[PDB]
Amino acid sequence: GSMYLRITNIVESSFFTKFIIYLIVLNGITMGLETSKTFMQSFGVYTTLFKQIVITIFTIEIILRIYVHRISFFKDPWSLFDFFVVAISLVPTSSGFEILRVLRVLRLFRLVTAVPQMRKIVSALISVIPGMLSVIALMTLFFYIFAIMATQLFGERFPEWFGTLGESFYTLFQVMTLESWSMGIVRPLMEVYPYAWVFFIPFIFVVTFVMINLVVAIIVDAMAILNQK
Amino acid sequence: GSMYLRITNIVESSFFTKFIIYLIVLNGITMGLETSKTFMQSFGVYTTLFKQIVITIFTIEIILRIYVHRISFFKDPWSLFDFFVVAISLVPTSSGFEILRVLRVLRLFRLVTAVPQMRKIVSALISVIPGMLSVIALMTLFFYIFAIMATQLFGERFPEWFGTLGESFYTLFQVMTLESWSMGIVRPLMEVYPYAWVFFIPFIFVVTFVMINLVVAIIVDAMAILNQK
Amino acid sequence: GSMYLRITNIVESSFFTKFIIYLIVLNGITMGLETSKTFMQSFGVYTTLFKQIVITIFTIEIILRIYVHRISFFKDPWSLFDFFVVAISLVPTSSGFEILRVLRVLRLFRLVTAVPQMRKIVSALISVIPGMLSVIALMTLFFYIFAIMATQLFGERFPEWFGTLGESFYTLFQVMTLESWSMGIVRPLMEVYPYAWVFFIPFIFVVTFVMINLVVAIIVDAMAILNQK
Amino acid sequence: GSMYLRITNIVESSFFTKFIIYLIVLNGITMGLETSKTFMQSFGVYTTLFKQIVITIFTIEIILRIYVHRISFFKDPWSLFDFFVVAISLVPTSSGFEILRVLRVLRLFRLVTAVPQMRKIVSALISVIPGMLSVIALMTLFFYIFAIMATQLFGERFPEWFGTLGESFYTLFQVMTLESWSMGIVRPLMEVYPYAWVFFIPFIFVVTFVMINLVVAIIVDAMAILNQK
Numbered sequence: 001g002s003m004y005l006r007i008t009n010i011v012e013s014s015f016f017t018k019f020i021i022y023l024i025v026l027n028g029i030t031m032g033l034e035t036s037k038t039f040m041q042s043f044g045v046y047t048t049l050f051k052q053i054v055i056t057i058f059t060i061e062i063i064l065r066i067y068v069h070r071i072s073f074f075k076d077p078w079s080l081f082d083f084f085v086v087a088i089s090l091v092p093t094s095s096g097f098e099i100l101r102v103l104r105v106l107r108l109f110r111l112v113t114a115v116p117q118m119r120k121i122v123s124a125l126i127s128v129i130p131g132m133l134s135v136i137a138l139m140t141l142f143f144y145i146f147a148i149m150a151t152q153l154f155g156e157r158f159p160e161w162f163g164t165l166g167e168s169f170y171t172l173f174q175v176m177t178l179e180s181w182s183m184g185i186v187r188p189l190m191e192v193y194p195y196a197w198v199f200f201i202p203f204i205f206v207v208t209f210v211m212i213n214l215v216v217a218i219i220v221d222a223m224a225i226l227n228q229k
Numbered sequence: 230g231s232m233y234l235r236i237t238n239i240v241e242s243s244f245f246t247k248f249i250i251y252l253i254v255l256n257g258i259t260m261g262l263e264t265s266k267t268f269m270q271s272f273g274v275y276t277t278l279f280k281q282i283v284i285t286i287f288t289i290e291i292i293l294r295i296y297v298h299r300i301s302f303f304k305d306p307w308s309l310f311d312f313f314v315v316a317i318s319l320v321p322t323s324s325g326f327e328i329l330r331v332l333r334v335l336r337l338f339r340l341v342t343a344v345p346q347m348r349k350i351v352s353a354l355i356s357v358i359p360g361m362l363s364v365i366a367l368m369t370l371f372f373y374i375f376a377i378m379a380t381q382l383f384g385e386r387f388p389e390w391f392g393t394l395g396e397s398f399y400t401l402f403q404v405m406t407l408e409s410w411s412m413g414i415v416r417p418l419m420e421v422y423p424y425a426w427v428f429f430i431p432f433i434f435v436v437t438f439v440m441i442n443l444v445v446a447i448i449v450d451a452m453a454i455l456n457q458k
Numbered sequence: 459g460s461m462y463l464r465i466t467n468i469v470e471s472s473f474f475t476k477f478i479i480y481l482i483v484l485n486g487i488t489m490g491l492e493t494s495k496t497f498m499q500s501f502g503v504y505t506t507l508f509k510q511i512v513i514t515i516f517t518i519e520i521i522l523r524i525y526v527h528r529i530s531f532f533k534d535p536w537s538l539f540d541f542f543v544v545a546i547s548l549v550p551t552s553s554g555f556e557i558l559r560v561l562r563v564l565r566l567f568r569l570v571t572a573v574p575q576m577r578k579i580v581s582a583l584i585s586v587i588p589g590m591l592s593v594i595a596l597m598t599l600f601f602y603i604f605a606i607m608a609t610q611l612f613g614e615r616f617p618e619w620f621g622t623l624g625e626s627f628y629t630l631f632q633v634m635t636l637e638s639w640s641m642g643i644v645r646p647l648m649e650v651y652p653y654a655w656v657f658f659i660p661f662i663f664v665v666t667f668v669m670i671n672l673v674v675a676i677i678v679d680a681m682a683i684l685n686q687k
Numbered sequence: 688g689s690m691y692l693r694i695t696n697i698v699e700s701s702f703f704t705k706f707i708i709y710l711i712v713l714n715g716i717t718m719g720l721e722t723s724k725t726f727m728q729s730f731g732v733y734t735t736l737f738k739q740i741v742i743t744i745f746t747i748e749i750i751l752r753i754y755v756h757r758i759s760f761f762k763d764p765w766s767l768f769d770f771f772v773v774a775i776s777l778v779p780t781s782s783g784f785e786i787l788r789v790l791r792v793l794r795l796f797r798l799v800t801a802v803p804q805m806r807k808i809v810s811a812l813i814s815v816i817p818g819m820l821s822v823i824a825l826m827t828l829f830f831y832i833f834a835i836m837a838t839q840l841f842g843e844r845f846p847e848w849f850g851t852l853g854e855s856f857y858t859l860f861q862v863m864t865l866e867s868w869s870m871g872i873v874r875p876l877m878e879v880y881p882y883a884w885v886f887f888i889p890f891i892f893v894v895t896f897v898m899i900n901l902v903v904a905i906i907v908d909a910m911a912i913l914n915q916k
């Protein structure tokens with residue numbers, strides 16, 4: 001169309017995409033100030049008014065660029081994200097949870113979508129994630145199995161830490177991060193169950209070894225790429 | 230045999246091995262629910278009945294596939310494991326410790342045996358372990374030597390941490406993981422023995438250095454393999 | 459000039475640059491003793507007298523070598539540093555903050571400027587920093603976004619940790635370092651907000667993954683250099 | 688000599704060196720039991736008698752093999768070690784400190800000297816240490832500079848942590864290991880000095896970055912060796 005091409009050379013234009021990047025950064029400062037109580041008592045109104053100005057601007061633009069690109073728009077990871085955070089954003093406050101108001105703050109991630117240098121590095125990081133899946137598999141299972149013995153051994157006498165399969169899952173996640181694993185968990189346990197270290201000193205070893213391998217794994221696969229290039 | 234070949238094309242068949250993978254996952258959910266007290270009051274019976282249905286199914290199948298494969302079955306790492314967790318499983322409750330009931334939960338690791346993609350990655354992880362043996366050697370010795378001085382210096386005045394060669398071994402294992410090493414151990418010690426940091430700041434250095442090397446070691450040996458391939 | 463060349467073969471001479479390296483090390487021992495209260499009661503005077511002897515010596519030499527090298531001197535990173543720590547040093551005590559007196563202690567970093575082997579390794583370390591910028595970018599943004607939800611969710615009931623966008627930034631920096639993240643932060647939170655782990659167990663994962671990549675990233679880029687050499 | 692060659696084919700013989708490896712392991716078990724109080728009340732005598740049997744055996748053998756090898760013996764790292772732990776060992780108890788009795792326990796490291804596979808890996812680990820010297824240099828200096836400001840800023844109001852240049856050095860060593868750096872140090876400080884995070888959040892960054900580089904450094908230098916081989 002003699003206009004469909006005038007609409008595309010608008011949307012696909014630099015100024016338009018660079019414009020909503022200046023409207024991203026102007027909004028991220030606003031979210032920053034809006035947490036201030038002092039700022040909110042004075043400049044609260046402008047702000048909440050400013051916040052409606054943008055959301056129609058984006059719904060304008062999410063409408064424009066979904067028209068420009070029709071059904072291709074919907075098989076794009078970045079675009080779908082922009083659709084699903086604007087959508088999230090459009091449903092208003094005091095309806096349902098208000099946790100959605102705090103989730104609205106995800107729309108800042110658009111700056112990663114809109115900025116190419118940023119979508120590059122995010123594609124790097126995600127490019128890594130298929131290779132580690134089998135380890136994440138094995139690993140999840142391993143946690144599962146130990147959550148179950150740990151509950152079965154300790155949940156009745158240590159209910160804050162092991163009375164639930166999830167309570168155990170969590171504590172175990174923490175012990176893996178080595179976070180007060182001894183003085184705060186294993187050591188308190190050996191006051192009652194004195195051979196508790198048999199369960200944890202092995203558990204630490206396996207998940208640390210598995211981690212070390214997971215990482216050497218990334219570093220070797222990052223290397224097949226260099227020699228191949 | 231005109232049947233030994235009908236028994237092999239059963240056992241070695243996809244549906245049969247994929248069948249006991251669906252009987253693995255159905256059992257792992259059951260172990261999950263069985264930790265719940267609510268679930269156990271209602272659906273306890275079905276469950277404990279379900280648990281006997283499987284164990285005869287596996288002892289059926291561990292019998293079948295030990296017949297199909299005779300004495301080869303017994304020099305296979307995965308198969309031996311399946312024999313030794315089913316065996317563990319067959320001895321019943323309220324005999325000996327009941328810690329064996331919690332050890333029964335190891336039979337979930339069959340999912341790593343039955344799933345090829347999973348036995349692949351487990352063979353990777355174990356493939357690594359010969360190379361690090363000399364470091365694990367040196368390392369064990371080093372811990373040993375320090376357990377002995379640490380007991381000899383601190384066990385009489387700090388018996389929860391150093392009165393035993395093992396008590397020391399453990400605390401030292403913990404200090405290596407940097408887990409409250411200072412605010413919870415070395416610092417409390419310098420209230421009595423003020424030059425205790427002479428023992429620990431060196432000890433941290435050596436075991437951290439040895440670890441860093443152990444890891445660079447894995448990463449270099451993972452590299453001889455790439456250029457060789 | 460028949461003297462400009464006699465001034466250059468002084469400044470650019472070994473003995474002159476090696477001289478102010480012996481005047482660096484003599485001064486760093488002095489700063490060391492000067493923290494002692496005993497030393498300061500006796501040898502305080504000599505010392506504070508000694509400290510004025512050097513600062514005129516350096517302002518002598520910073521004047522000489524800025525003359526020898528005119529405006530080239532001012533586009534050199536090491537030289538500019540030497541200018542800006544001597545300058546810092548020249549403004550005296552009891553004027554403004556006295557935090558500048560503690561900042562005077564930065565002039566020890568001249569030993570890294572004056573010693574080539576040392577400016578080599580510092581140029582290595584800084585040589586690394588362009589490549590990680592996009593990750594430091596993404597990363598800063600990510601922290602920002604979570605500071606804002608974390609304040610919005612927890613600052614009213616946990617003001618020491620989340621009542622400020624910065625208070626949150628800090629706590630979050632700490633949680634990233636895994637430092638009492640559970641027993642000291644997330645666990646205290648679940649006494650009031652029981653699904654707080656939904657915010658933190660994801661947050662730990664993302665920033666740990668991003669870190670692992672940041673590091674594998676350094677190691678791969680250090681490798682393009684070897685094959686290229 | 689018609690005997691100097693009979694003395695060398697003794698010392699240099701397998702059985703002789705393998706003999707004192709069985710006398711090493713028999714002694715290391717003895718040190719292990721000797722920490723037990725029960726064992727020492729019964730079998731104490733045998734033991735302390737056993738301990739004199741070996742020390743003359745080694746002084747026999749350290750005499751033999753210093754004769755076999757004359758002055759070459761004294762420029763060998765492993766041999767010198769064996770001389771200097773036996774020497775340490777020969778001076779008896781209740782003279783000077785008794786800390787030397789606990790230092791006698793170092794003679795177990797002979798097992799690393801006597802076992803080739805073990806002296807191999809120890810030579811690997813030490814082979815690494817020249818390359819990191821410039822970083823250990825820079826690093827020591829950096830710690831030094833911060834010890835001095837940290838004392839100058841905090842030692843008067845926090846004397847257990849910063850009243851000494853060494854007290855500071857230690858605390859700083861601990862903060863580097865991230866060990867309760869926040870909840871136990873920086874956080875307690877901001878109750879008095881509220882912009883203390885300006886000193887520590889930078890300090891953590893620099894020493895973590897320097898560490899990451901130190902390690903990528905080992906991994907790259909371990910790689911020049913592979914392509915060169």
Ligand SMILES: CCCCCCCCCCCCO[C@@H]1O[C@H](CO)[C@@H](O[C@H]2O[C@H](CO)[C@@H](O)[C@H](O)[C@H]2O)[C@H](O)[C@H]1O
Pocket residue numbers: 125126176177178208211212215636662663664666667670
């Ligand atoms: C952008 C999308 C991101 C999707 C994220 C995908 C999840 C990836 C899982 C990686 C994170 C696992 O979570 C984290 O793993 C590290 C591995 O460094 C482990 O952490 C522990 O062991 C490793 C051993 O290698 C050490 O490096 C680390 O210092 C220690 O704390 C813990 O298990 C946990 O802190």
Ligand SMILES: CCCCCCCCCCCCO[C@@H]1O[C@H](CO)[C@@H](O[C@H]2O[C@H](CO)[C@@H](O)[C@H](O)[C@H]2O)[C@H](O)[C@H]1O
Pocket residue numbers: 178204205206208209212354355405406407437440441444
């Ligand atoms: C599937 C079978 C598995 C068999 C397991 C074989 C055991 C292998 C030993 C490796 C585990 C040693 O146990 C663990 O080692 C790590 C090394 O990362 C050390 O951990 C500490 O030092 C290292 C330095 O490299 C850091 O990476 C780590 O963050 C820190 O906590 C501790 O010593 C201990 O937490």
Ligand SMILES: CCCCCCCCCCCCO[C@@H]1O[C@H](CO)[C@@H](O[C@H]2O[C@H](CO)[C@@H](O)[C@H](O)[C@H]2O)[C@H](O)[C@H]1O
Pocket residue numbers: 583584634635636666669670673865891892893895896899
């Ligand atoms: C000389 C000038 C220096 C300029 C400094 C530039 C800043 C560079 C940023 C690197 C430092 C980031 O700060 C530090 O990052 C490490 C990454 O190891 C993270 O630390 C955590 O995760 C990583 C996972 O890789 C683990 O290695 C580490 O043991 C764990 O504590 C934390 O986020 C923080 O402790």
Ligand SMILES: CCCCCCCCCCCCO[C@@H]1O[C@H](CO)[C@@H](O[C@H]2O[C@H](CO)[C@@H](O)[C@H](O)[C@H]2O)[C@H](O)[C@H]1O
Pocket residue numbers: 407433434435437438441812813863864865895898899902
């Ligand atoms: C056999 C002789 C041995 C001689 C020993 C020579 C000393 C070598 C110095 C290396 C040890 C430095 O001491 C240790 O360094 C590690 C680096 O992993 C740092 O540790 C911290 O930062 C690093 C970042 O890389 C992380 O890997 C680590 O999990 C974290 O705790 C600390 O600074 C200290 O725990």
Ligand SMILES: [Ca+2]
Pocket residue numbers: 178179180407408409636637638865866867
């Ligand atoms: Ca900790």
